[PDB]
Design goal:
Strand content: 5-15%
Name: Endolysin
Strand order of the largest sheet: 1-2-3
PDB class: hydrolase
Order of helices and strands: HEEEHHHHHHHHH
Entry title: pseudo T4 lysozyme mutant - Y18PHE-methyl
Radius of gyration: 16 Å
Number of strands: 3
CATH class: Mainly Alpha
CATH architecture: Orthogonal Bundle
Assembly: monomeric
Keywords: halogen bonds, T4 lysozyme, hydrolase
Number of helices: 10
């Protein structure tokens, strides 16, 4: 198990424009296109991201390319963020993947806002952190995925993904 397989499990794969859990136009492996209600706006973003006129449909290869870029972007977001980097640096490789997963789903700024959870993680108070992480819109809106990610933080194993 690794961060790419983990996020593939959590995000799936769809090759035509769809709406994510929040109603936002998305494609591929959880690639957010726009928060605009305009499908045309979403298609413009997609064409820009891929570099061709797609009319809302892409290939698996193209989806995996956006995914590589998005995982890269999540890691670089963590490393450039003054709140996330020390926590990332303090973690083991499995819990690092859990943090990348969160940033992939809700963005650098959103995760950096989890101040009390981040502190408990840096303190390696895993059960406490797990409890704190669940007191969130994140958990309430996507509880099964949040549960997997939280279990990964709690145990430092891949148990929730096998």
């Amino acid at each position: 198990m690794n961060i790419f397989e983990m996020l593939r499990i959590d995000e799936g794969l769809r090759l035509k424009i769809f709406k994510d859990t929040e109603g936002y136009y998305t494609i591929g492996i959880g690639h957010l296109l726009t928060k605009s209600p305009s499908l045309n706006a979403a298609k413009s973003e997609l064409d820009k991201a891929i570099g061709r006129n797609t009319n809302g449909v892409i290939t698996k290869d193209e989806a995996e390319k956006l995914f590589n870029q998005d995982v890269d972007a999540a890691v670089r977001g963590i490393l450039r963020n003054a709140k996330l980097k020390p926590v990332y640096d303090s973690l083991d490789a499995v819990r690092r993947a859990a943090l990348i997963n969160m940033v992939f789903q809700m963005g650098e700024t959103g995760v950096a806002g989890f101040t009390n959870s981040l502190r408990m993680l840096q303190q390696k108070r895993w059960d406490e952190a797990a409890v704190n992480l669940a007191k969130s819109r994140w958990y309430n809106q996507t509880p099964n995925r949040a549960k997997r990610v939280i279990t990964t933080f709690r145990t430092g194993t891949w148990d929730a993904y096998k």
